[PDB]
């Protein structure tokens, strides 16, 4: 069980850790988050009480170093940093725990929600989508644009999701225009799975990371990426059976976790209607179709 200490909390802020969240008051003696489960990526996220615009946060894995949060009064945000001195860090964490100034990652033992949302998400893949190679952790916020969004403007601060475009030469083989446009199996299996992702795990990892950025930061380009990756599979007549079974589970936990109040901005009516009712895979997502029909029948 790992710890992300905080130097202090000088400004009033809602703090998120994965799917949990806590209100901290201006100058409240809050010194961080303990009992963080080893074995998963995590995201620690922020919304200032005074500016409910700019949700922002840090993807990290405690196996990769000792990480703390410290408020920067110049840049006006909670910043993640690495402590390279192992003994200084253990000594800081031990004091804050003794003084019980830390909230406990509040995991219910029965509850596999975070595992289910992050099954294929790897910290090494996050660091290729979010490029800042001098840090072991990755910053994301509401306003960051995707490489694809920039083509249709600062590359340093962009989300480098794999570009998917159904009306592109990459997607359509010369002489198989109608076939490749109505059945995207070629684009999914040869171009994307064998060509770029190499395996279904890396594909699912990017899909899951795009969803979580959409949900935790309301990042619009992430939302577009998540829908595109769903639609490419649902619009393919030929998908390995294990990928369909696993997609059903992934989407089930995503729909189960989505705040009921955000379904109107985070869910694309056209894509979901097409995927559940018209697509080749319309009969292949039983768990996903049941939770969508019971929780968001309006959208459908």
């Amino acid at each position: 069980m790992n710890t992300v200490p905080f130097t202090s909390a000088p400004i009033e802020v809602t703090i998120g850790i994965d799917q949990y969240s806590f209100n901290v008051k201006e100058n409240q003696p809050f010194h961080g988050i303990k009992d963080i489960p080893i074995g998963h990526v995590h995201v620690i996220h922020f919304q200032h009480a005074d500016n409910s615009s700019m949700r922002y946060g840090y993807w990290f894995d405690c196996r990769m170093g000792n990480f703390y949060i410290q408020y920067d009064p110049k840049d006006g945000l909670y910043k993640m940093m690495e402590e390279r001195d192992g003994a200084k860090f253990e000594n800081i964490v031990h004091n804050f725990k003794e003084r019980q100034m830390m909230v406990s990652y509040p995991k219910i033992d029965e509850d596999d929600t975070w595992y289910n949302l992050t099954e294929f998400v790897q910290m090494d893949k996050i660091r290729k989508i979010v490029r800042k190679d001098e840090n072991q952790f990755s910053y994301v916020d509401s306003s960051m644009t995707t490489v694809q969004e920039n083509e249709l403007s600062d590359p340093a601060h962009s989300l480098n999701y794999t570009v998917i475009n159904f009306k592109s030469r990459e997607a359509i083989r010369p002489g198989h225009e109608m076939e490749d446009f109505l059945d995207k199996s070629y684009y999914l299996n040869t171009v994307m799975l064998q060509g770029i992702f190499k395996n279904s795990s890396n594909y699912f990892g990017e899909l899951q990371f795009a969803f979580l950025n959409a949900m935790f930061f309301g990042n619009y380009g992430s939302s577009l990426q998540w829908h595109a990756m769903i639609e490419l599979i649902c619009s393919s007549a030929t998908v390995p059976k294990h990928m369909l079974d696993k997609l059903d589970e992934i989407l089930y936990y995503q729909i189960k976790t989505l705040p009921e109040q955000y379904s109107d901005i985070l869910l694309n009516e056209r894509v979901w209607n097409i995927c559940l009712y018209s697509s080749f895979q319309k009969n292949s997502l039983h768990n996903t179709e049941k939770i969508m029909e019971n929780k968001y029948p309006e959208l459908l």
């Binding site: 009306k167 592109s168 030469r169 359509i172 225009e177 109608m178 446009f181």
Partner: protein, 237 residues
């Protein structure tokens, strides 16, 4: 985006453009089978590809053999149309290639866009205009070459005959759309109006009769009257 009443003069500027109409590509007669079920029999069709500035018509005849053993023919017809338009653009010298293609039906946008990915500088556009190009098979000489075809064939026409010697493109296109609108609303009546006076003939190298300027005005008036009558009938107004 879409071509409408507001951006109408753009049709007659010096940027090469083509209208594509796919409404006569897939044509059937519906009949009873011996067992009393219904079946279709396909007949020859055509893609109607028109430069509205020059009057040049690229009539690609669609022979019934292209449908043999194919499923979902009304969907395939949109893709076949896009394949043939794409092949036509690639067969034209660069300086003759269109800068825009306007499709008369929105269902042609995705098929044409996907066939034309090699031509990112050619804009594919829909239109708000309700163009009567479906009535092209009411022009006797176009109907005759489609129905006699025994194989795939491209036939070049000028749908304005020699009118551009006397009138602007704008005026030629308005005359064309009025003739086709009449032919579409009441074919028999429209055709009586065009051929009633036997002294006015159709030249071997033309589609329409050799009307003087004065006779075109009378003809245009008869077509307007035909259209408004049928409108009162359709709508009991």
């Amino acid at each position: 985006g879409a071509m409408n009443s507001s951006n109408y003069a753009e049709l007659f500027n010096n940027d090469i453009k083509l209208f594509v109409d796919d409404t006569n590509v897939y044509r059937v007669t519906v009949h009873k089978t011996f067992e009393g079920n219904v079946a279709t029999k396909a007949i020859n069709g055509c893609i109607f590809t028109l430069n509205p500035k020059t009057g040049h018509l690229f009539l690609k005849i669609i022979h019934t053999s292209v449908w043999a053993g194919q499923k979902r023919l009304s969907q395939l017809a949109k893709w076949k149309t896009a394949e043939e338009v794409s092949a036509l653009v690639r067969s034209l010298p660069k300086e003759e290639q269109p800068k825009q293609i306007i499709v008369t039906r929105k269902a042609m946008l995705d098929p044409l866009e996907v066939h034309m990915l090699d031509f990112p500088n050619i804009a594919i556009r829909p239109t708000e205009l309700r163009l009567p190009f479906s009535a092209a098979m009411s022009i006797d000489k176009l109907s005759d070459v489609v129905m006699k075809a025994t194989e795939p064939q491209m036939v070049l026409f000028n749908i304005y005959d020699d009118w551009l010697d006397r009138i602007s493109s704008y005026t030629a296109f308005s005359r064309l759309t009025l003739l086709l609108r009449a032919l579409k609303t009441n074919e028999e009546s429209a055709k009586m109006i065009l051929l009633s006076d036997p002294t006015i003939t159709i030249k071997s190298y033309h589609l329409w009769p050799s009307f003087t300027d004065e006779q075109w005005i009378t003809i245009e008036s008869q077509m307007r009257d035909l259209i408004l009558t049928e409108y009162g009938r359709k709508y009991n107004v």
